[PDB]
Write a protein that binds this ligand. Structure first.
Ligand SMILES: CCC[C@@H](NN)c1nnnn1Cc1ccccc1
Length: 329
């Protein structure tokens, strides 16, 4: 089997991407944030505290003839400071024509304010390794983990758009969706993430610096978080850019034209255009703009979030030894 679904930015800044997901019988379609950095499929629901729902579409398990309460099971996740928790159903879940029966659907009883305030995101669909799933007392599998054995090939791909729709495919690699070749690189699953090591970077037309940068491929993170040395080298090329303690990261004059940023994947190179690094005014009407490359110092891990991933066609290879692949597009 295969599946193919379009993923759409939630706003004009590409803050996150939503993908329609069919849950239950008859189908209830919710727009979920596919997150390769976490491992829970959770949804706003008829059980979510009413004051914490503000425009989201909810899952109502009592209206699904295939929903079954997973007795005794609860979940709770803390992400960036946001959080959510609740109970668990199993139900039929379909993405882009690929169906899993008996998928754990984590129904929120509580969500934190940042979820409530984002009317466009009806929940998360985790695509990291199932060892990070939070369901207790019996940990549950991700959608991909449940689908894997049925897929034509045990893979999914992320093809995120810049200010435009893109695609998540399951079970096949669309050879028309990228240019050149896919370069594969080793993954460590020891922290539950799609963790890999970039071979270095360049700023604009500058010379490539060969250096190992260990980080995660995370579709659920907006920005690119890298070591402070790398980030300082980038922003030094932008007149007037500065790290602002009060704003919480590097800011730059909105009048600037930003340089590109290149990252290494083996001997291959992925180029992030400068415009992908502009996240617009820090507050409405300001002429100070927020940067899309930020320090990972104090996160504890480097994060190749959407800023980086949307410059590439990315293969999440869930073979017995997982690997990642990157191609230009
Ligand atoms: C180890 C990160 C996992 C990641 N899952 N999408 C996440 N989970 N919660 N937030 N993120 C992103 C983030 C965290 C800290 C600072 C900036 C971005």
């Amino acid at each position: 089997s295969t599946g193919s679904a379009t993923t759409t930015p939630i706003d004009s800044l590409d803050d996150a991407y939503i993908t329609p997901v069919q849950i239950g019988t008859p189908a209830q379609t919710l727009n979920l944030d596919f997150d390769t950095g976490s491992s829970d499929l959770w949804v706003f629901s008829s059980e979510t505290t009413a004051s914490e729902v503000d425009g989201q579409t909810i899952y109502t398990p009592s209206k699904s003839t295939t929903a079954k309460l997973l007795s005794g099971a609860t979940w709770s996740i803390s992400y960036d400071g946001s959080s959510s928790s609740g109970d668990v159903y199993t139900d039929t879940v379909s993405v882009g024509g690929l169906t899993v029966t008996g998928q754990a659907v984590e129904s929120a009883k509580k969500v934190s304010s940042s979820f409530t305030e984002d009317s466009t995101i009806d929940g998360l669909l985790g695509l990291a390794f199932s060892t990070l799933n939070t369901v207790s007392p019996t940990q549950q599998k991700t959608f991909f983990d449940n689908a894997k054995a049925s897929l034509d090939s045990p893979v999914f791909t992320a093809d995120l758009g810049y200010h435009a729709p893109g695609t998540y495919n399951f079970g096949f690699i669309d050879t028309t969706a990228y240019t050149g070749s896919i370069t594969y690189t080793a993954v460590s699953t020891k922290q539950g993430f799609w963790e890999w090591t970039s071979t270095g970077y360049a700023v604009g037309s500058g010379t490539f610096k060969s250096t190992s940068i260990d980080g995660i491929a995370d579709t659920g993170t907006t920005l690119l978080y890298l070591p402070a040395t790398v980030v300082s080298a980038y922003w030094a090329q932008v007149s007037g850019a500065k790290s602002s303690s009060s704003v919480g990261g590097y800011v730059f004059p909105c009048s600037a034209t930003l340089p590109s940023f290149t990252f290494g994947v083996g001997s291959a190179r992925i180029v992030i255009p400068g415009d992908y690094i502009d996240f617009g005014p820090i507050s409405t009407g300001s002429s100070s703009c927020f940067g899309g490359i930020q320090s990972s110092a104090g996160i504890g891990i480097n994060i190749f979030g959407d800023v980086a991933l949307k410059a590439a066609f990315v293969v999440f290879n869930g073979a017995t030894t997982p690997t990642l692949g990157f191609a230009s597009k």
